[PDB]
Symmetry: C4
Subunit: 326 residues, 4 copies
């Protein structure tokens, strides 16, 4: 029943409220804010930064021309020389500004030697334009690179299963790579999520309890070429020790699964996520194989990635009762 902490696609279902002092923090941590806000708003924010600087300097060059009297004699002559040739109005001043900062510089409109202030504005604008260009480029460059996107081409199975492997009752789920490029330093985690009351009567809204998948022997570290089935041996130390098939079909909990590792190309860590409600766990099932031998290679059939099949010999009791008996 209880709605889920994290969805099948990995997105976490939690909203933060009464975080009143956030704008001051988001300002101090601005580069972070900027790479998170969605494309449309960023490209717009940087369009504004150009437009604003272009209009700003455009105005200054216009003022200089207004004061110097260039608007009445913009081409100059033998006696009179303007600060900037051909600034005859605001649009021309705007054009000169864009031409200068972009560094297009068609040159019909052109700064002269006459006005040290105009020369200074060209100096300052050039330097400002380099700074702004850097900021844009960077933000775009960072945002482009964001390795969270790699989780789209990493795949968890829709279902987890419980079944016997090598004499032990195990929780299992599957993970796969939809690319030729590897996930480097790849390793996995899992957590049981449920509310809990401590023996001292403390209510934990959602306690996160570790699901052991081999950390202590380094077996949480995986080298995934073809899809792999992750194993959680359900034993005395597991929080599913007393969970039988009957319990599972009526119980209310969640199992969050995580795959972390580096995108081979950029060597930046991504974190793929998914989840399994107690209802989505299939007792007495196993995954259908996807790897098979070829003439000169192996092949993975991703059509059979999510598919499972029942195993009647699977005990229906919990792992506690399975050992309590024998």
């Amino acid at each position: 029943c209880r709605n889920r902490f994290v969805k099948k696609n990995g997105q976490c279902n939690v909203e933060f409220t009464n975080m009143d002092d956030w704008p001051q923090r988001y300002i101090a941590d601005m580069f972070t804010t900027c790479v998170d806000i969605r494309w449309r708003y960023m490209l717009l924010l940087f369009s504004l930064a150009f437009l604003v600087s272009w209009l700003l300097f455009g105005l200054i060059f216009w003022l200089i021309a207004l004061i110097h009297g260039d608007l009445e004699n913009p081409g100059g002559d033998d006696t009179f020389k303007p600060c900037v040739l051909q600034v005859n109005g605001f649009v021309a001043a705007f054009l000169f500004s864009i031409e200068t900062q972009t560094t297009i510089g068609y040159g019909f409109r052109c700064v002269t030697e006459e006005c040290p202030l105009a020369v200074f504005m060209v100096v300052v604008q050039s330097i400002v334009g380099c700074i702004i260009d850097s900021f844009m480029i960077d933000a775009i460059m960072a945002k482009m690179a964001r390795p969270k996107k790699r989780a789209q081409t990493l795949l968890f199975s829709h279902n987890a299963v419980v079944a016997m492997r090598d004499g032990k009752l195990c929780l299992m789920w599957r993970v796969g790579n939809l690319r030729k490029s590897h996930i480097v330093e790849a390793h996995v985690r899992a957590q049981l999520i449920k509310p809990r009351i401590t023996e001292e009567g403390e209510y934990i809204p959602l306690d996160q309890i570790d699901i052991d998948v081999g950390f202590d022997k380094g077996l949480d570290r995986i080298f995934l070429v073809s899809p792999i089935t992750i194993l959680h041996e359900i034993n005395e130390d597991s929080p599913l020790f007393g969970i039988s098939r009957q319990d599972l079909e009526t119980d209310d909990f969640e199992i969050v699964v995580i795959l972390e590792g580096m995108v081979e190309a950029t060597a930046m860590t991504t974190q793929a996520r998914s989840s399994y409600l107690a209802s989505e766990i299939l007792w007495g099932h196993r995954f259908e194989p996807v790897l098979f031998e070829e003439k000169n290679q192996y092949k993975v059939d991703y059509s059979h990635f999510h598919k499972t099949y029942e195993v009647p010999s699977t005990p229906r009791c919990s792992a506690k009762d399975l050992v309590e008996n024998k």
Copy 2:
């Protein structure tokens, strides 16, 4: 009493003195120096690099024009052709330099085919301008990206508490994320800081003693969506084993807490810090919940993040006496 090693905001309160050979080291490690020095001074340092190069080449082009006799006939004619059209003085030479290096190139001032030296300067300046532009861009790009800034949007609680959980006396503190973007490969550390004399009579000004929060089982690794309460079970192996409530209110020590993990966007490791003096630790208290169930999601009420409430049933004695008795 004793002033603190690290402040609540994470900044470390230590000054380095008699580090006499630092400038030679800071030069060899220059990129590091440059990204650390504050914005104002960096933007100024790069403004100078442009201005210096602009003035430098400006001077050379002026000298060439002076020697070649272009200052007396800058437009040239049927018989005489200058090295650079329209370099009539220093300002013009300066303008040509800026126009060339920025690559604005209005073109009224324009290099000719006549002087192999002028042609060589345009070649060298162009190449110098690319180098300098790279250096600026980079520094700005690095400095912009600095992931320490992410610690502003990560939150430790103002207080740590001591209380019973699941039959064990525990030190606790809370950590939270003020963003939707995750901290990847997130994990926590803690250290007790105090002076110490060894049995051999050695004085350690500030010994740093580990506060176990689950490293040996990988439980120091956390997946924080909603705020989490970090647990240090106070047992025989803990350095707070013999610390009772009475001791805590009169004792003088510090507990430094660290949260490390990667900014999801850039996948760069940040290190959030805070601290708790013995006085700031609240014995017999617990944190008020912030996570609650909604219709279709969960919600975190950050107004109640720092709030605590007393628990009278909490034993007042140390964990040593708690086990010495039973």
Copy 3:
């Protein structure tokens, strides 16, 4: 017999099929796709992005000139002023577009103050050109940096060997650095690859079984200056415990070896790989030394890197029988 999971050069021999929904995923994870597709196609893709944008804006400027009547009077006069000087046809419009977006801006063709639409196109194109330039630069920058390339200058030996060291039967293989720059945070892994049927009758096409090389004591972490010989002590916990020399020469399995660590320069993790078929493992052999003392240094003779030599005293039985006897 069975063909190998991963080749000597580290490339994995697996093809993914029936991955039907890949284009939608590869689009959402586009930056990843782009850095993977080989140079030729990327440089072409970015050549198209310029050409397309250049043609696009070229067409718009031409339309403006067509409508405004500039094609009949492109230089303008005392009464008539064009939107863009000297746009006399499509090629001229194309030239103006390239000149503007590249920001070359020769200026013979030059935007005027007359047409707010032309002024707007110059604004939009400039901003589009900055965006596109960023995307190109980035992709090229990422692709250039790709640290997988570092595996070319890291070397596994062609053969693994089995031999006695310090009273224990050990699997061994060698690793080496072909550069002066180090591999930082370097560490090693190994896995036995073979098909397997579980006692419950489940077929695992290729189970991956850990080959212990010292993870639990941190001895998998290596500091490689000169070549190093990696050791897998074959003991009760090893999956080669019951493998004797006779078994090895007739058995069918694979040993995949991995060296992970960061390129000192970029501090990006690379993952060098190789493999050993059961046939490629030389029982009763040891590697010939390559490090020798010099006058003022040490020297590595990479000619003798792969060379081995037999040791008759090596027991021919498995490590199980070696301990079963004594």
Copy 4:
């Protein structure tokens, strides 16, 4: 006597010879080569790339002008229009090439609409110039960022010492940060380096044997604000277990020390190194303190960083004999 594997400044003293196939590998791993070769040669290599491309296209534009007959009528007239205005010789063609690729584009020399080949060269050169600019920028950007440089501002002590702490005989050495910016995820390693013959008579030129500094409890992980003294408890599992003071003064071995961690700014892992010959280890000594209490802070006196002082109560026998007796 035997010369040392790694020097006090961290540089490793090993030369690689008979690495015959290196150029083909260094080519495949080119980005790596490029960032390693020293500044002077890189800046020169990129100067050549510009010069080469500038000369190349310069030549093509000249050929076009030669064939089209522009060299005889470079300004054009009412009947004749050149491919590129004012290309009157090679220097002019060279100038036009530089002007175009740099995108300075003074414009006196200017491509026309006349020659589709000239228009194509401007297109191709622009695109080539963007590519080359990217390569340069990148290389410079990577090389600039190289985090090895951070090891200059990290400090090992000149000496290691042996002394008693808390009832155990310990090897000790000191590490320090010469910056305000932290080393994130900082941790330490150590290795004993000496030649060795195995009981099976195998000669290991330089075996590397781990010096335990707390890996198994995570105590190798350090949070260094002020300088820290690293401890290696010399016990039964240590390879210095049977080393007494007398042995140390006549013995021949080396102790390599490593500090790894991320530069806070760039979050890139650096690896500081140093070494101690058996002669450089001071038995019965301890380091002088450098941290002392101030009014409102702490202060580190780096003048006393390397200084030690004797402790007569230090046992002169090995840790083996120290426990063999009691």
